[PDB]
């Protein structure tokens, strides 16, 4: 048997527990388990103008349950629903009150519209079926899922990638644009950050609802703690090499003679427009306080305006380091400065606006009814929900069958969200999923967001990109991956307060710039000393302690800080933890694994593997093989072939090629004909090329054994003589064989459908 | 559905990274056979190997030959798999050449080939570029309502 | 799907080559290659179909809703 | 699509009556097919 | 040399906090500002082990030794103790040294 | 390659313990990179020269190289002899991380096989950082062409 | 000067000495001195 | 003018149509029936619920 | 050298990224002479010349001292005529405040000139002025031609003061401009430059064409 | 080897700290400040804690130090807000022990302006004095403007600025201490007589 040299059976256990395609299934299950029940509590009170007694109140909402009978008693079967030109759906069920009688309140439990559910999820038929329900349901038990049939065809929500949200990204230009930009979100405000520099020292806060400019020396002195000495001491450093450059724009608080009483609010907001109504709501403090709090930061800061002060104070500490230190820039291509949204977040942002556009029209109907001296509305409140129930269903189908999501609270138009599901091959159906689309789609920029970065070892595939105009923008994602979801950042911060930090209530000194100060994804907690012991304690707590389970900590020595990332969207990859002498194979762990027990989601409990891809590994050192260990390491790599994706995973010996041919072949590997599914002869497709006599790959890559590509191949095997024959062999010019092609070599089946629905007219 | 016989003009690409469109179809026996007499199916360009810089296909023919010889479906994943040192030992232990080469006999004249020719199986996938789906024509036909052009 | 009656490159028949291979793999077990050596395979392009070719027609005939 | 087209988007470029309908126009009597090599023809 | 920095900085901090704890605090008006984290399961019983390994915690509950907090500027003193009827304050005075309890696992 | 890595090890450790000087260019860490690139291109030139000197008769890469077909003698050296010093933006690969490039390389990486020097041929099998570096060079060349 | 003025904690500015001796003071702060030569680096 | 009244009638007929679970062609059939009836000046000044319900009932 | 170079020549852009002024000298690197040309026409880093900027407050409307470094400029001797520093300061505005009354006293104590704001403007504006050379010139690198002659390149835009400077001969100045060359040497020299620089930026990558096409490209825009 | 006892015995809870952001630690590396003699006045349930400190006589009788012209400045002030923390404690060192008084209450302060803080509003009110723009609308001023509760149109202030609004409603004058030694020292030890581990 194996002693320590296997290092391979962690990937089939990972594929058995979690699976390859889980960027849609897990996110949609978390959506319908938590967020669909959570966001309705933010909109439950529907009080009207006329007759101030009427209300509804949402207490429960669930999808496709019907908690007296079974789930739907049909829950219309998926392959049948694809041929019927119906959308695959399961309805909503809610529980609400009324004000029916003079002393009677009903609790009628109604439904509101339909809703599509992607395949292989929790609320579906095809969950946990194995060749019996699969045979009665007449569909192939190998499809990746993550899609749902809407109006006959099926659509796939692509995994959208954007930049980070609560970070401070550095930009640069030709010695004028040293803008230290950002974004922010309190779930309803982004609008800008625009921290641009015009004159040296003058890095005025810009905004679109402001006339000209606001200096830093009045922001940090008005909505920050005021000393006119800490602005030289707390925010820039102690040695004179930075303060001699920061000497400009420190006398501007003395030039205009502001000197905060209330005029340091009056000067920073006498130029803001449109004060929300005709009341003239400033009252010399109000619009200034609310413009400090809600339109420029993510913290409500009800009493202490010092945390935002330290956030801007550490934001302006980098632009001085972007000036004295000769132009080091955290560019917006690194994966740690990159978070991607999934299908659940996009469908949640659709649903939270379409529920508002439902509720406003239902309240309009309530106000339309309550306007006559008739008896009060008993049963028309019980009724008249299945009259705007075709506003959630029709909109929820239209926005996923077209791909243009008009929202009336974020003011964006997102085009090209989904795509019709190409079934050229099983590799096509696997590789169109697990795709990272982008925002930089059509822009001719060289060596920007087109060249791949070295932070892609195991994160994304380094050879999967279609050639053409979209080269470096729609790259796919690797095998051993996981995407973090966010539970809550508050018990994490309180546990950091337990583990020996101080707060930002007592920390103003010249000793702010000692050893690394701890953060929580864009919020400073304390400038603590002894950084290696804190990282060691949290290193032990992430394996042994109670609740961390998705946290990346990393010490950055150049900007002298340590961060804690806990937001959802970053990628992961498993890796084996080592402690100074050895790995964690130890002849008994993998033996218990392949004996038939102790599978994945237990090696994290014991401490074997731990999936992570943030710049935690930048504060680490990962080995390659077993015979490479040095007694100063942190971790090692499980398999080296996890860097190539699934579409790059059928190439026989890929490392014996140059990279453009691997890129070309992985681009055109999701294009060949094949043996798409088991219901190949029982389905009706608009464009379906089929292989007549498919054969196995003669040589098997150790990734296509796992994705069942050996079961469902996409080609044909043939012996071939490499020679220059008959002059028809010039430049990729093959020459075939009659009476060898006549025996069924490469025979094709092209299937096109032609549906003409006969309709009866309105005449 | 129509059962398209793969005609001349159709794309045939290897899985390893070289594309290809067929040039002519050979009847049965104008392609060079061997001592066992196995006529190969396709013939690739030797010029497609250097400037495209592919040497793993040249290992793929040997690995496919030993996989179809010894029975076992062989490896060839990234950075590991079945090596070549034992592979040449298997090829020379059965009785074949240690490099995949073979002496072949020419079709149009019957004598031997002056240089050796190596041949073995490659997984060949066919693409969605049938010549019936890409042929185009034009006559004095339909014109637009806006410029009276096709 | 179904194994072809004759192989592509050569012309030797491949009938009584598949069921006599799975019958020999289930009962009277051999490793992988002595099976073909005792069944009568000599040329190694006649051996790239019985060794190859996952059976798809046994998975296609599963889908019959009480036919 | 919410720009309307007047007598400037029909003359603007790459789809108008200057750069794809007048200078480069879709001609008649053509055909488009992939190419296979053949040495045995002369170079004419 | 982060383990070495841990070693010499903890040795210097332990010797400094042992020297400072046993001088000028018998009876002047001299204080000390602790921190102790939440979720405590006290007798105190704060033991001291020799050879520089100051095992400074309680030995009734789990031992999670650690100290050495930041020395900071801008003197922060309790300095008073009041109530609300018409109340007055107290002399407390002269906070000098900062010390927290960093728990180990 | 061993004496080249030894010479580069002294050439970097005489800056680790001492200092380096240069007249025409900048102060530091650019003429260092230029000298490493030159002393590793000399390796490729010499090993390709002894490869084409050693190479067989009727050798079909040498047949195409002596005739002007697909691939020059540089391509034959990349086949057999060695592959080295991929070209991105006129220099070696930059920092993909803070202070280094990959997790398999130590911090303050300023040595060969730390900042983008492949050492294996296409026959011998490439290292996974070397495969990543060749992927860097291939995608950069392809998007530059586009 | 980049002053350090105790008892008021504000930056000092050397304006005109109000029709007479060239003095230095702060804005509404009692900490001041006459000139003795500036401490410029 | 009259087109705004027919737009309000089309919205009310859309409401009763999607509430009573009828297909989309019979909505346009009831719309052209209501247009012909309003061209014949059949009713005026109702609460229009009974009118739209009667037109959708006969369609 | 690439396609932005042939893109930027053919449209005759008013600004240009890093041009060179290949000036030819008379003497070689013997001990001082070519280093004088290397030091004169480029830039004066006055942050190294001053060593600090100091004033003292004793009298009303005090003055700001500037210290010269004679031992530092006894390596690159160009303008040891320290009244020339004073007349370069009386080059009038240069920072929107005139420094005219800068009357120097012995041992190099220049007496330059609310009050503190115009003082700190001169504090953070004085290490930006130049005492010799064009302000449109960054630096210069001297090269070695194979015969033995030294040919220094100049990153700049002038081509009038580097031609006016004694020590270099005004025979050949191989530059990258196509519009400033027109402005300082007329029509035919600019068209010879546009048929020469296209040929120079294209033959460096092989791909050599018949230069009569280059002449026909140069004639149809000049 | 050496055991120290510590016991929680805090039941007073009003001992807020004050981070004096004017005084460096041991100015000139010699302890010569002793600056804590001052007075104060507080504000309940709004967390202001202003403190005024007396003057030394360096050079004033200067005109620019009270206003642009005059208020007659006689005292410096300082004020700062701050939310209370959770976990910190004090200590007593009674000859061999540690007592661990709870602190639990933090509010940092900054130097607050002493007579400019009414001067700018006073000058704008004096400029707004005797102006003819308040015409006869001041006679018919009615307080009949009672509004309904915020039905789904736009809302009130509602707690977002309540800590910003409550800064002028009430203020308490809390006197100096100047003699307090017995109360928070001996009663703490008397509490240990009834604690008994
Ligand atoms: Zn055969
Ligand atoms: Zn002052």
Curated annotation (Swiss-Prot), chain A:
It is found in: Nucleus. The keyword Heme does not apply. The keyword Signal does not apply. GO terms for molecular function: DNA binding; DNA-directed RNA polymerase activity; ribonucleoside binding; zinc ion binding. Its EC number is 2.7.7.6. It is an enzyme of class 2 (transferase). One of its GO terms (biological process) is termination of RNA polymerase III transcription. Its main location: nucleus. Keywords: DNA-directed RNA polymerase, Metal-binding, Nucleotidyltransferase, Nucleus, Transcription, Transferase, Zinc, Zinc-finger. It catalyses: RNA(n) + a ribonucleoside 5'-triphosphate = RNA(n+1) + diphosphate. GO terms for cellular component: mitochondrion; nucleoplasm; nucleus; RNA polymerase III complex. Transmembrane segments: none annotated. DNA-dependent RNA polymerase catalyzes the transcription of DNA into RNA using the four ribonucleoside triphosphates as substrates. Second largest core component of RNA polymerase III which synthesizes small RNAs, such as 5S rRNA and tRNAs. Proposed to contribute to the polymerase catalytic activity and forms the polymerase active center together with the largest subunit. Pol III is composed of mobile elements and RPC2 is part of the core element with the central large cleft and probably a clamp element that moves to open and close the cleft. Belongs to the RNA polymerase beta chain family. Present with 1950 molecules/cell in log phase SD medium. Component of the RNA polymerase III (Pol III) complex consisting of 17 subunits. This is DNA-directed RNA polymerase III subunit RPC2.
UniProtKB/Swiss-Prot annotation, chain E:
It is found in: Nucleus. Its main location: nucleus. GO terms for molecular function: DNA binding. The keyword Nucleus applies. GO terms for biological process: termination of RNA polymerase III transcription; transcription by RNA polymerase III; transcription initiation at RNA polymerase III promoter; tRNA transcription by RNA polymerase III. One of its GO terms (cellular component) is nucleus. Keywords: DNA-directed RNA polymerase, Nucleus, Phosphoprotein, Transcription. Present with 998 molecules/cell in log phase SD medium. Belongs to the eukaryotic RPC4/POLR3D RNA polymerase subunit family. DNA-dependent RNA polymerase catalyzes the transcription of DNA into RNA using the four ribonucleoside triphosphates as substrates. Specific peripheric component of RNA polymerase III which synthesizes small RNAs, such as 5S rRNA and tRNAs. Essential for tRNA synthesis. The RPC53/RPC4-RPC37/RPC5 subcomplex is required for terminator recognition and reinitiation. Component of the RNA polymerase III (Pol III) complex consisting of 17 subunits. Interacts with RPC37/RPC5. RPC53/RPC4, RPC37/RPC5 and RPC11/RPC10 probably form a Pol III subcomplex. This is DNA-directed RNA polymerase III subunit RPC4. It comes from Saccharomyces cerevisiae (strain ATCC 204508 / S288c) (Baker's yeast). The chain holds residues 274 to 422 of 422 of the full protein.
UniProtKB/Swiss-Prot annotation, chain G:
One of its GO terms (cellular component) is nucleolus. It is found in: Nucleus, Nucleolus. GO terms for molecular function: DNA-directed RNA polymerase activity; nucleic acid binding; zinc ion binding. Its main location: nucleus. One of its GO terms (biological process) is transcription initiation at RNA polymerase III promoter. Zn(2+) 1 binds at residues 5, 8, 26, 29. It comes from the Eukaryota. DNA-dependent RNA polymerase catalyzes the transcription of DNA into RNA using the four ribonucleoside triphosphates as substrates. Component of RNA polymerase III which synthesizes small RNAs, such as 5S rRNA and tRNAs. Involved in Pol III transcription reinitiation and RNA cleavage during transcription termination. Belongs to the archaeal RpoM/eukaryotic RPA12/RPB9/RPC11 RNA polymerase family. This is DNA-directed RNA polymerase III subunit RPC10. It comes from Saccharomyces cerevisiae (strain ATCC 204508 / S288c) (Baker's yeast). The lineage of its organism: Eukaryota, Fungi, Dikarya, Ascomycota, Saccharomycotina. The chain holds residues 1 to 41 of 110 of the full protein.
Curated annotation (Swiss-Prot), chain I:
It is found in: Nucleus. Belongs to the RNA polymerase beta' chain family. Component of the RNA polymerase III (Pol III) complex consisting of 17 subunits. Present with 6020 molecules/cell in log phase SD medium. DNA-dependent RNA polymerase catalyzes the transcription of DNA into RNA using the four ribonucleoside triphosphates as substrates. Largest and catalytic core component of RNA polymerase III which synthesizes small RNAs, such as 5S rRNA and tRNAs. Forms the polymerase active center together with the second largest subunit. A single-stranded DNA template strand of the promoter is positioned within the central active site cleft of Pol III. This is DNA-directed RNA polymerase III subunit RPC1. The chain holds residues 1121 to 1363 of 1460 of the full protein.
């Amino acid at each position: 048997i194996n002693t320590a040299q296997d290092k391979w059976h962690l990937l089939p256990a990972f594929l058995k527990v979690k699976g390859l395609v889980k960027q849609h299934l897990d996110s949609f299950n978390y959506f319908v388990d938590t967020d669909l029940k959570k966001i309705i509590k933010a909109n439950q009170l529907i009080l009207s103008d006329v007759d101030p007694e009427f209300y509804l109140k949402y207490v429960d909402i669930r999808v496709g349950k019907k908690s007296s009978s079974s789930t739907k008693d049909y829950l219309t079967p998926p392959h049948e629903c694809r041929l019927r030109d119906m959308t695959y759906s399961a309805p909503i069920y809610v529980d609400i009150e009324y004000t029916r009688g003079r002393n009677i309140i009903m609790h009628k439990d109604v439904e509101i519209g339909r809703m599509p559910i992607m395949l292989r999820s929790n609320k579906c038929i095809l969950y946990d079926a194995d060749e019996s329900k699969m045979a009665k349901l007449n569909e192939c038990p190998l499809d990746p899922g993550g899609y749902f049939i809407v109006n006959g065809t099926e659509k796939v929500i692509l995994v959208q990638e954007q930049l980070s949200k609560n970070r401070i990204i550095v930009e640069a230009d030709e010695k004028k644009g040293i803008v230290q930009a950002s974004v922010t979100s309190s779930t309803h405000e982004r609008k800008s950050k625009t921290y641009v520099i015009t004159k040296n020292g003058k890095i005025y806060l810009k905004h679109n609802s402001i006339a000209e400019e606001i200096p830093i020396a009045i922001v940090l002195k008005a909505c920050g703690i005021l000393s006119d000495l800490e602005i030289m001491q707390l925010v820039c450093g102690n040695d004179s090499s930075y303060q001699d450059i920061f000497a400009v724009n420190l006398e501007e608080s003395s030039k205009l003679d502001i000197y905060t009483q209330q005029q340091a609010l009056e000067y920073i907001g006498a130029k803001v427009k449109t004060m929300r109504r005709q009341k003239l709501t400033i009252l010399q403090e109000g619009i200034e306080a609310i413009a400090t709090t809600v339109i420029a930061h993510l913290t409500v800061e009800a009493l202490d305006f010092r945390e935002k002060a330290l956030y801007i104070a550490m934001m302006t500490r980098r632009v001085v380091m972007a000036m004295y230190n000769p132009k080091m820039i955290d560019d917006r291509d690194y994966v740690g400065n990159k978070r991607l949204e999934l299908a659940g977040q996009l469908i949640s942002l659709l649903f939270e606006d379409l529920f508002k556009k439902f509720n406003n029209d239902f309240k309009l109907s309530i106000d339309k009814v309550l306007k006559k001296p008739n008896r009060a509305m008993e049963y028309d409140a019980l009724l008249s929900i299945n009259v705007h129930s075709n506003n959630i269903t029709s909109g929820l189908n239209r926005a996923i069958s077209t791909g243009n999501w008009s929202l009336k609270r974020f003011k964006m138009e997102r085009a090209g969200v989904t795509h019709v599901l190409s079934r050229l091959s099983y590799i096509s159906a696997l590789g169109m999923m697990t795709r990272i689309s982008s925002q930089f789609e059509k822009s001719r920029k060289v060596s920007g967001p087109r060249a791949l970065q070295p932070s892609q070892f195991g994160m994304l595939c380094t050879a999967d990109t279609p050639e053409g105009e979209a080269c470096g923008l729609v790259k796919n994602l690797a095998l051993m991956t996981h995407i973090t979801t966010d539970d809550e950042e508050e018990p994490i911060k309180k546990l950091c307060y337990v583990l020996g930090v101080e707060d930002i209530t007592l920390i103003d000194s010249a000793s702010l710039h000692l050893n690394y100060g701890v953060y929580l994804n864009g919020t400073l907690i304390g400038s603590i000393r002894f950084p290696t012991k804190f990282v060691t304690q949290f290193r032990h707590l992430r394996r042994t302690g109670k609740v961390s389970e998705f946290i990346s900590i990393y010490s950055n020595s150049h900007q002298m800080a340590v961060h804690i990332a806990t937001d959802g969207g970053r990628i992961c990859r498993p890796l084996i933890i080592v402690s100074d002498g050895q790995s964690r194979v130890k002849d008994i762990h993998l033996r218990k694994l392949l004996d038939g027990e102790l599978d994945f989601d237990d090696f994290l409990k014991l401490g074997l593997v731990e999936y992570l891809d943030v710049n935690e590994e930048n504060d680490s050192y990962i080995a390659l093989y077993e015979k490479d260990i040095v007694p100063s390491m942190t971790h090692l790599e499980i398999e080296p072939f996890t860097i190539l994706g699934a579409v790059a995973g059928l190439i026989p010996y890929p490392h014996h090629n140059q990279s453009p041919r691997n890129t070309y072949q992985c681009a055109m590997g999701k294009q060949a004909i094949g043996a798409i599914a088991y219901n190949q002869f029982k389905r009706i497709d608009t464009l379906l090329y089929l292989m007549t006599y498919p054969q196995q790959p003669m040589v098997k890559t150790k990734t296509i054994e796992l994705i069942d590509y050996d079961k469902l191949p996409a080609g044909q095997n043939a012996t071939v003589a490499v020679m220059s024959y008959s002059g028809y062999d010039i430049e990729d010019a093959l020459v075939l064989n009659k009476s060898s092609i006549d025996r069924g070599f490469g025979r094709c089946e092209t299937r096109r459908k032609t549906t003409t629905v006969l309709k009866r007219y309105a005449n | 559905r129509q059962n398209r016989r793969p005609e001349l003009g159709d794309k045939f690409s290897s899985r390893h990274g070289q594309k290809g469109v067929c040039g002519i179809i050979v009847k049965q026996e104008d392609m060079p056979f061997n001592d066992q007499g196995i006529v190969p199916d396709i013939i690739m360009n030797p010029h497609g190997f250097p400037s495209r810089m592919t040497v793993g296909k040249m290992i793929e023919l040997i690995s496919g030959k030993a996989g179809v010889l010894n029975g076992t479906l062989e490896y060839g994943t990234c950075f590991g798999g079945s090596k070549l040192e034992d592979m040449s030992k298997i090829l020379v232990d059965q009785g074949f050449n240690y490099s995949g080469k073979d002496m072949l006999y020419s079709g149009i004249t019957g004598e031997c080939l002056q240089a050796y020719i190596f041949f073995g199986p490659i997984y060949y996938q066919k693409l969605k570029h049938m010549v019936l789906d890409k042929m185009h024509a034009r006559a004095r036909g339909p014109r637009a309502v806006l410029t009276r052009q096709p | 799907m179904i194994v072809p009656v004759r192989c592509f490159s050569c012309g030797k028949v491949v009938g009584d080559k598949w069921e006599s291979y799975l019958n020999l793999l289930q009962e009277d077990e051999l490793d992988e290659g002595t099976a073909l050596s005792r069944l009568g395979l000599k040329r190694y392009c006649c051996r790239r179909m019985i060794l190859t070719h996952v059976d798809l027609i046994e998975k296609f005939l599963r889908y019959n809703p009480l036919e | 699509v919410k720009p309307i087209r007047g007598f400037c988007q029909r003359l603007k470029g790459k789809q108008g009556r200057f750069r794809g309908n007048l200078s480069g126009k879709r001609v008649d009597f053509s055909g488009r097919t992939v190419i296979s090599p053949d040495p045995n023809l002369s170079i004419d | 040399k982060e383990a070495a920095a841990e070693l010499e900085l903890l040795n210097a901090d332990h010797q400094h906090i042992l020297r400072k704890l046993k001088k000028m605090n018998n009876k002047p008006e001299r204080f000390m500002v602790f921190q102790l984290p939440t979720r405590l399961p006290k007798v105190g019983s704060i033991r001291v082990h020799k050879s520089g390994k100051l095992s400074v915690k309680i030995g009734n509950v789990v031992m999670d030794i650690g100290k050495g907090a930041e020395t900071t500027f801008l003197q922060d003193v309790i300095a008073l103790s009041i109530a609300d009827d018409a109340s007055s304050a107290e002399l407390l005075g002269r906070v000098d040294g900062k010390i927290v309890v960093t728990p180990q696992i | 390659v061993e004496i080249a890595y030894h010479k580069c090890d002294e050439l970097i450790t005489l800056f680790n313990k001492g200092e380096l000087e240069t007249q025409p260019g900048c102060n530091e860490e650019q003429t260092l990179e230029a000298k490493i690139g030159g002393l590793l291109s000399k390796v490729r030139e010499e090993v390709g020269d002894v490869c084409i000197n050693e190479l067989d008769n009727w050798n079909a890469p040498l047949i195409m190289a002596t005739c002007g077909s697909k691939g020059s003698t540089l391509n034959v050296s990349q086949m057999v002899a060695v592959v080295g010093q991929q070209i991105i933006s006129g220099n070696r690969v930059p920092d993909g991380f803070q202070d280094r490039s990959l997790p398999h390389f130590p911090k303050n990486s300023k040595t060969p096989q730390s900042k983008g020097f492949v050492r294996n041929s296409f026959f011998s099998g490439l290292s996974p950082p070397e495969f990543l570096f060749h992927a860097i060079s291939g995608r950069e060349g392809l998007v530059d062409t586009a | 000067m980049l002053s350090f003025c105790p008892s008021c904690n504000n930056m000092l500015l050397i304006t005109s000495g109000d029709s007479g001796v060239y003095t230095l003071a702060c804005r509404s702060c009692p900490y001041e001195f006459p000139i003795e030569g500036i401490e410029i680096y | 003018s009259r087109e705004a009244t027919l737009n309000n009638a089309r919205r009310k007929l859309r409401a009763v149509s999607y509430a009573l679970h009828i297909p989309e062609y019979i909505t346009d059939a009831a719309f052209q029936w209501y247009k012909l009836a309003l061209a014949n000046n059949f009713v005026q000044g109702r609460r229009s619920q009974n009118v739209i319900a009667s037109c959708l009932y006969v369609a | 050298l690439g396609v932005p170079r042939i893109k930027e020549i053919i449209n005759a852009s008013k600004v240009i990224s890093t041009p060179i002024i290949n000036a030819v000298l008379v003497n070689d690197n013997d001990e001082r002479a070519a280093r004088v040309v290397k030091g004169r026409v480029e830039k004066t880093l006055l942050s190294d010349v001053a060593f600090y900027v100091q004033d003292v407050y004793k009298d009303n409307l005090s003055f700001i001292q500037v210290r010269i470094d004679l031992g530092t400029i006894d390596k690159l001797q160009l303008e040891l005529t320290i009244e020339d520093i004073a007349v370069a300061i009386t080059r009038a505005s240069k920072l929107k405040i005139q420094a005219s009354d800068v009357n120097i006293i012995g041992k190099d104590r220049i007496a330059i000139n609310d009050v503190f704001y115009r003082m700190q403007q001169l504090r953070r504006a004085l290490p930006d002025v130049v005492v010799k050379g064009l302000p449109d010139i960054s630096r210069a690198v001297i090269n070695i031609r194979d015969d033995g002659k030294r040919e220094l390149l100049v990153e700049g835009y002038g081509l009038r003061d580097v031609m006016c400077t004694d020590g270099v001969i005004g025979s050949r100045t191989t530059t990258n401009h196509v519009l400033e060359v027109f402005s300082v040497l007329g029509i035919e020299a600019a068209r010879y430059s546009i048929i020469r620089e296209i040929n120079y930026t294209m033959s460096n990558h092989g791909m050599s064409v018949d230069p009569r096409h280059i002449q026909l490209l140069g004639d149809v825009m000049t | 080897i050496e055991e120290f006892p510590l016991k929680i015995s805090g039941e007073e809870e009003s001992l807020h700290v004050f981070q004096y952001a004017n005084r460096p630690r041991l100015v000139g590396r010699k302890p010569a400040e002793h600056p804590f003699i001052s007075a104060a006045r507080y504000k309940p349930k709004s967390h202001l804690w202003e403190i005024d400190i007396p003057l030394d006589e360096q050079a004033f009788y200067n005109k620019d130090k009270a206003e642009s012209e005059w208020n007659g400045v006689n005292v410096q002030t300082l004020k700062g807000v701050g939310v209370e923390n959770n976990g910190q404690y004090a200590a007593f060192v009674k000859d061999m022990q540690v007592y661990l008084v709870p602190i639990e209450r933090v509010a940092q302060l900054k130097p607050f302006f002493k007579y400019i803080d009414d001067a700018n509003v006073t000058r704008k009110q004096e400029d707004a004095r005797r102006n003819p723009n308040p015409s006869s609308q001041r006679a018919q001023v009615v307080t009949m403007s009672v509004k309904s509760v915020n039905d789904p149109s736009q809302n009130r202030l509602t707690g977002s600025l309540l800590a910003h609004k409550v800064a002028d409603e009430e203020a308490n004058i809390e006197l100096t201490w100047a003699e307090g030694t017995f109360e928070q020292f001996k009663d703490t030890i008397v509490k240990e007589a009834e604690d008994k581990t």
